[model samples]
Each structure stands twice: as structure tokens, then as C-alpha cells.
Target chain A: PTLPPYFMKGSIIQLANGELKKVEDLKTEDFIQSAEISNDLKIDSSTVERIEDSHSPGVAVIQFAVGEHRAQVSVEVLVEYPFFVFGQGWSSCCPERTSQLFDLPCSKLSVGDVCISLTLK
Target chain B: MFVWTNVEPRSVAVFPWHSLVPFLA
Candidate 1:
């Protein structure tokens, strides 16, 4: 399915160590855990080729190439996940207001926990 | 740069502008 252009930007992901970093900021050797997919879907230090907007509003398509295995993820599911912090810049125009609505402290997150990444670009 | 928009009704209601400025600017 085709996605919107807004989904093309990098995302802000919260690491297991309570640190927040942009998807683009991650190195090719860094591993990332998938929030929506099964345990087998864990990212094994693959390089993020691009993140594009889906034709569907409020949806993002993340593309990656891991060795010979190519994969794409629709980030909408991640946003819908409960307890996932949809930060201001990513989900709302008003940062303060949005943060009040769905902000989750990094301390509350744990390893293997799933959450939507914010766009830091 | 142009602001991106989401066509979904819920998204429109939540983010009226639906622009990439706040997130991707």
C-alpha cells in the first residue's frame, strides 16, 4: 500500500536504557526491538534505508535491508499500541498539550517494550 | 519545505495541520 509523504522522516525511539534517540541517529550496527511484530521480528543491527509516509494518514513506512532480507514496517500499529508514548512533535501540534495526553517517562519503559518513535528530523 | 498531511479523519481531528514541521522540520 502507498503511504503519505509525512512518514518519510526519521523517528525518535526510546532505548531500553531510558535514552531517547532518533532513528537516523542509530548506527547500522545497533539493534532495535520491534514493538508490534513478533519476537522473531527483532531488528538485528540493520541499516535503516528510509522512512516514508504512507498514503494513509497517520501512518509511516519504515524500510530496511538486513543482508539479503528486505523489510518494511507500517508504524501506525506502533502508535495505536497502548502505553506507547506518542510524543508531541510526532502525534500532536501542541507539544505541551500532547505530552500531557500521552507522554510516558523513559523510566517506565523496559527492555523489549514497544513504543512509537518520534520524528526528530 | 511543504507540510505533510494525514487524510484520516481521526488524524485530522487530532492534528489539524498534519504537517511535518513539528516532527520533521
Candidate 2:
């Protein structure tokens, strides 16, 4: 992914210290749980390196139920972003380690598709 | 600067994560 992907401004960010935040409100040194996948589904801690964004043409509002508890989660994603689709694996973004590459626009995301979500409200 | 736009570009604010913030990749 040559271009940087972006999440909708309304997407709530899950802070490591247990708090929710807006994307534009983010500051440097902000920490969050990264779903950086390796051979296994690896969850790692990452910090804000830099913030890059642009005026997107449109964004996909992804709403879905996650976890066995079945909590409804939602987030706005851009075609430039990566998402875990229900059937298809990765739809966008760079695979940090090495994984499947779809490079499809996240606009293809369905209501029940997967996206970066917050752990708590 | 160049941006990959799908539609006419509806909203203005969008952000991708990396480094300190948890990344989507």
C-alpha cells in the first residue's frame, strides 16, 4: 500500500490504558492494541509513529458483531484501509509480516465484515 | 500530493494507524 489508509473520523480508538478517542484528537505517543497478525493471530502493542490523512472521497461504515459474546461494533473505513472480510481475508493495507494480499478497496466491506474496533465503549 | 479516491470523496477526516498507535495492518 503506497498510500496511507485512513479510518473514519468517528471511529473510536481503543487506548491501551482503557479509554476511547477520536482519530483527529490523537496525539503523539498514543498507544493502542494492534492486531498485527503473524503466523498466528498476534495482538501487539504499538504507538503512534505519525499521523497522515487526506480528504477521502467516501468511506465505508462497517458495522458488525464481534466475539463470542456478540457485541455490535462499528467503524468507518476507507477503501485504502485493510479489513478482515467474512469470506475473503484481507481487503486492503500492507501485511506487516507476510500474509494474503487482496488490495481490494474496503468499500467492498459488508455490514458483518471485520474492522478495527474498540475493546470497550 | 496524490490520494486514492474511490467515490467523489464524501467525508474530510480519515486516519490510518502505525507505530505507537495500534495499527490496522
Candidate 3:
């Protein structure tokens, strides 16, 4: 999906080092705090393309990729360490509401629903 | 659960191309 135009600036991200900086301030070599997506790829700065606001103002969709695996990640996992991504395999969650917005489900959804395909390279 | 779109609703942001590509490669 194409990103919105106005949402092109002014987001803040906290680095693993505990320093908070505007996403605009991110530079090469800086670590983006992330959770491990798999044995091969842990969500990191190298995988992140951009961040979009989702659910609420503070929440976001972290657009990320590694090799062939690419998808949007929930901000919940990004906010703290020992981060957890939607795990692989089937899981459950509430039905979708509006585009980019869903009622926080009482259960988890399929890992397939959350994680992008990881093509072996 | 949020889907991405071109229409602006809440805040959305992208990195400057110069800063974005290096890490991905």
C-alpha cells in the first residue's frame, strides 16, 4: 500500500540505547529498537523502511523487511525490549474494523496473518 | 490491523531516500 503524503514527517523513535530521537533524525548505523522476527532476522534498522500511525496516535505500523520477508509490524512490540513479533503459524485475533484499525482482539491471529513470507535466498 | 493507504488520516512518515536505501541494501 502507498503511504499517505502528509504523514511524511515528525515521528519519534527510541533507539535500543535508550535515547529517543525523531525518526527524521535517524542516521546510518543507528540501531532501531526491534524484536526478533525469526532466527535469521530480528527487526532492526536495516529492515525498517518507515513507520505509519495505526490504532491510535502513539501506535504504529513498522514497515520492515529482511531478505524476502517484508511486512508491517505492530508498535506494541517495538516499544520495549525482549520484543515479540506475531509468531509463525496460525493464531487468532478480533475481526478487522476500519482499514489500519482493529479492535484489540482477546486472542491472537495466525502468524501468517501478521508476518510476511520469508523466501529462502 | 491497520492497512496502509495514500489517503491522509493520521500521521504517516517516510525516510529520506538517501537515508533509507543504505540499510536495506
Candidate 4:
């Protein structure tokens, strides 16, 4: 059961299938534009950590970053199976919660299969 | 159903530090 989470960066995006997604597909017009800034830890550093720990239900991590303006912010991702689906990202202190529970649309998945992707976003 | 590995895959890879802290003690 080797759940090799795909690492993503810059323009290169990782799909739910654990495959590389093209940035061209991320059209703002095709999908709703939403952003969230927060102080919570991100999935790569938090929820994914827990999921990899047990790989049972699912994982959710809210990630934060410090920009040039010294703005400390974070984003949230809901991961299930092998995918990290990016939903409505929010800013901390916005009076809204960012964590989303893991609920896969599919009934079953193999151990090594990836079910998370950014295509939906 | 991915198994964890001790080797660091990359700089961004988040090691399971919290869950494994007890073993280090």
C-alpha cells in the first residue's frame, strides 16, 4: 500500500489520478474563482501527514505561507483516495471554516490508486 | 493504500514527525 502523493509546484499541477495536469486547463472562466488566506497548516504539512499515517478515511490540511508583504496566509484542500481536490479557499479571520471532510464519490479504490485531482476545481 | 517510506522524496515532502515522535524518545 504505497500511497505516493504527487508533489506539485509552480505551473505544474498534479491531477487526482496522480498524473501531471496542464496549467492551461485551469481556466478561470471554466470554474468559479475563489481564494482563501489563513494561518492554518497546509495539507502537505498537516492532513496529508495524518492520512499517510493511517491511510484510512481521508485527509484535510490547511496550508499557510508568508508573502513579500509579510502576509501570513493559508489554503485548504480535501483529499480522498489519491486526490487533493481544491475547493473554496478562504482567508483566516474571515468568519468561515475551511476544513472539508473527506467523502469520495466512488465506492471503492485500490491501495495504490490515486483518487484526488484538481480537474474539478 | 500507499505505504510510508523513510527516505525523503523531496524537500517539500512532509515527514510524519508528529506520529513518530514517541518512538524517538
Chain B TM-scores per candidate, in order, are 0.16, 0.16, 0.23, 0.16
Name the lDDT of candidate 2.
0.37
| Chain A vs native chain A, TM-score per candidate | 0.28, 0.33, 0.25, 0.20
Model 4 TM-score on chain A? 0.20
Ranking by DockQ: 1, 2, 3, 4
Instruction: Give all TM-scores, in the order shown.
Output: 0.25, 0.30, 0.23, 0.18
RMSD of 2: 16.9
Q: Where does the lowest 10-residue lDDT sum fall in candidate 1 chain A? A: A80-89
- Tens-digit lDDT string for candidate 4 (A19-90): 343332333221222111212211221121112222234343322222223233333333432222233221
Better of 1 and 4 by TM-score: 1
lDDT of 1 by residue, B1-25 (tens): 9776965553221111112111211
* Per-residue C-alpha lDDT of model 2 across residues A1-121, encoded as one tens digit per residue: 2323234434555554445566444543342233322222333211112122334553434444455444444444443455434334333423331122222323333343343332332
Alpha-carbon shift of residue A91 in model 3 (angstroms): 34
Best by lDDT: 2
As a whole number from 0 to 100, the lDDT of residue B21 in candidate 1 is 19
Scoring each candidate complex against the real one, what DockQ results? 0.06, 0.04, 0.03, 0.02
Better of 2 and 3 by lDDT: 2
> What's the CA error at residue A36 for candidate 3, in Å?
11
Q: Can you write out model 3's per-residue Cα lDDT over A26-89, one digit (the tens) per residue? A: 4433432222322332333223444443565333354554443453333332111111123321
From the highest TM-score down, the ranking of the candidates is 2, 1, 3, 4
Best by DockQ: 1
Query: How many residue pairs collide in each prediction?
Result: 14, 10, 8, 20
